[PDB]
Structures are given as C-alpha cells and as structure tokens.
Paper text:
We have found substantial variations in the activity profiles of the Rai1 homologs, and discovered that some of them possess a new 5′ triphosphonucleotide hydrolase (TPH) activity. The overall structures of CaRai1, AgRai1 and SsRai1 are similar to those of SpRai1 (16), KlDxo1 (18), and MmDXO.
The CaRai1–pU5–Mn2+ complex was obtained by co-crystallization with pU5 RNA using 1:2 protein:RNA molar ratio in the presence of 10 mM MnCl2. In the CaRai1–pU5–Mn2+ ternary complex, clear electron density was observed for the first four nucleotides of the RNA. Two Mn2+ ions are coordinated by residues in motifs II (Glu174, αD), III (Glu223 and Asp225, β10 and β10–β11 loop) and IV (Glu244, β12), as observed earlier in the MmDXO–pU5–Mn2+ complex. Similarly, one of the terminal oxygen atoms of the 5′ monophosphate, the scissile phosphate of the substrate, is a bridging ligand to both metal ions. Therefore, the RNA is bound as a product of the reaction, and hence its nucleotides are numbered U2 through U5, while nucleotide U1 would be the leaving group of the substrate. The structure revealed that Glu104 (αB) is located near the expected binding site for the 5′ segment of the substrate. The side chain has weak electron density and assumes different conformations in the two CaRai1 molecules in the asymmetric unit. This residue is unique to CaRai1, and is a Gly in the other Rai1 proteins. The presence of the negative charge and the larger size of the side chain could interfere with the binding of the substrate through electrostatic and steric repulsions. Arg159 is not conserved among Rai1 homologs, and the unique interaction with this residue may have helped define the bound conformation of pU5 to CaRai1.
Residue numbers in the entry: 0 to 390
Write the structure that this text describes.
Amino acid sequence: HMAKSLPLNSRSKTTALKQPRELFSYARDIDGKYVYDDPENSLSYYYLPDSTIDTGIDLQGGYSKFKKIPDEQNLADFNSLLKAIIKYETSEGKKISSDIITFREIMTKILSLPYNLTDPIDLYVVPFDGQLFIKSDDELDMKRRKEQEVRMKQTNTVERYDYMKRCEYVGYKFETIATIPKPWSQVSRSQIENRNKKVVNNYEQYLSVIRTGIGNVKLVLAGEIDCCWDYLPDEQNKKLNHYVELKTSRIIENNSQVVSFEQKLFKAWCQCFLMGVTKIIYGFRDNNLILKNVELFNTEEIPILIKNNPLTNAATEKKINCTNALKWYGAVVDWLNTTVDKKDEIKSYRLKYDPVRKSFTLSETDSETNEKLRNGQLLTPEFTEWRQSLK
RNA sequence: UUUU
Ligand SMILES: [Mn+2]
Ligand SMILES: [Mn+2]
Ligand SMILES: [Mn+2]
C-alpha cells in the first residue's frame, strides 16, 4: 500500500548538536529481572593494570561455564523501560519532555546506515501522549538472527564455528576481567585478583536513560553502559562524562584489517556519540584469544582519526565520514518529527530501510498490529494510565 | 557480545 519515503541522499544543512544528559538509570540483575531502586549499585568500574595485561589473560577461559541469556529473552524491553519512566516521572510530577523515546541501538542503526547499506532496518513507530515510541520489530530480528546462525553453522567448519562462538564469549569475558563492582577504593585485593575465575554472565546490565537532541528534535534514549572510568559523580549533568564502552578486536596485521577496524570503530563512535559516552576501550587479542594490549580512545577524537588515516582512503561515497552520517541522522529524525501526527493515537507505523529496493519508508501498520503494540507489545496499561492521569 |  502507500508509504512515504525519505530519499537516502537526504542531509540536514547544518549540525546543531545538543549535549546529552542522563535522566535516570535502572538495571537488570543476574536472574534477568529489572531493578529500579538504587540501580547505581549495579554499575561496575574500569580496572585493568598493565601488570595484569602482561600476564597474558586467556579470554576464552571459562567458556564452558558461561551463563548466557537466551536471545528471545534479551530483546530490548519496552515494558521495563516504561516502568522505569513511570517511577521517574512520578517523582518529577511531570512527563519527560521529548519528541522521541527509544533505545540507543535503534538510532545507532540509523546513524551508521550510510556506511552499512546492506543492513536491513525494521522498526515500529507508535504515537502516544504527544510522543513517538520507537521499537524494533522483534519477530523480524529473531528471524534474521536464526537465519544468520544457520548460515554460519552451514558455511563454516566446525572449528571456525566454535571459534566464532568463543569470540562472542570473549567480549563478555573482557568486561568481566577489566572491571570491578565498586571503585578501586572500596574493592578488596581478593575481588581484584579473583576476576579471572569469576563465572561470566550476560544477564547483568546497567542501563542509562538520557535526554539528547539534534536540530530542533528532542530524543530520549535507553542504553546499556559497560562501566564507569573512575567514579560516578553526584552532579547529574556530569554522570555521562564518566561512562566507558568496552570492545574487543583482533590485533591488526594488514591493511584489510585496518579498514575493518575503521568500520568497527565508526560503529562504536555511533553508539557512544548518541549516548554521551566519552571513552572507548579496546582489548586487542591474538588468534588464540589471549589479550595482548588495551587501548583507550576518546570518542570526540575518533572523527579526526578516521578522516586522517592515510591507509583508509576511498571514493567520497564509500569513505566513512562522521559529519555526513550525522547529517543523514538529523534529516531522518526531523522527517519523523514533522511527518507523523503525534496526537493521532488511532494508528501505528512500520519504519523500514530496505537495502534491495534502496528505500527508507514509513507505512501504516495493520489494525491487529497497532492493537498489539498499544496493548502490551510496546505500550503497557500501567504506562497509559499513568500518562492519562497527568491530564 | 561478536568474525581479517
Ligand atoms: Mn555486560
Ligand atoms: Mn555493553
Ligand atoms: Mn561493550
């Protein structure tokens, strides 16, 4: 049926960037249950001395005891985010002011789209109480994840497939061996030393909810935070400044590896720029998954590093440029903000990037889909009642 | 989280 499309070459004229600020946080515990009071108790702190790095940490250590959340249980959870929002807004006596409320991974997909043209995007947009609630199409995502899985099983040897699954584990192991549950001053020597034996899980999470903007649009983004650098300030407008994102990558050996590392680093920049995270730490590991060295990047410096790398030139259309991405992102969110009637709660929309047709479109959902979205699948009855109560 |  009919759909409105934004041309893929659309770009905002300038870049008016607002500084992000954390509004509140919440957490997920080791059993997968969300926590809304004293969530700061779930924030870890970065701690990884060179002397420890020198020992040659095995990042596949403990792979067989990995406590891994099933993928079906690890989708972005609007229920819990809305519950966190009701708690905050009840304290403030007022709704959060924003045009869009969503998860950061969703905007990361949009922002990085210009240099990741083969990757699909399928989202749902639900207007409610003067705001746009945006979530991913869970069913399509799971279907793509399953089909990616079966590809990778079929097309790689048993050895390569096992290695790739171990590489998935490596990311979480690095987080485990590079962080401590409290700042250096409150942690004991045992805790520090025993990290390499701790059971690794990906259940526990600390989530920041931030307000930010671009152009004249306001966005609230929920995103998971890997750790805190030194201490968490009490000053609300400074909390984001102390967060850190962790990554792992293979040590780099040829120019092929250099362009791939540029691509990953851009995606890391996308994720951290949106969230106000100022530090990205890479754990570089070898073929046997031993950690070899660690490097800190300042988020704000990444655009310069990318623009000035003598090894990674390409045609202007293919060369990653952070400013160009930001102008595409700004065009998208302004389009969403002026196209959809935020006051019409009678329907919902699919927002889709289709790489085969090269199109970026908004179309109305089916009545049954709108109903599901508004009665549990995105909006919850507790949240709708809360918002109706303020008016 | 993750593949040179
Ligand atoms: Mn984690
Ligand atoms: Mn993370
Ligand atoms: Mn990370």
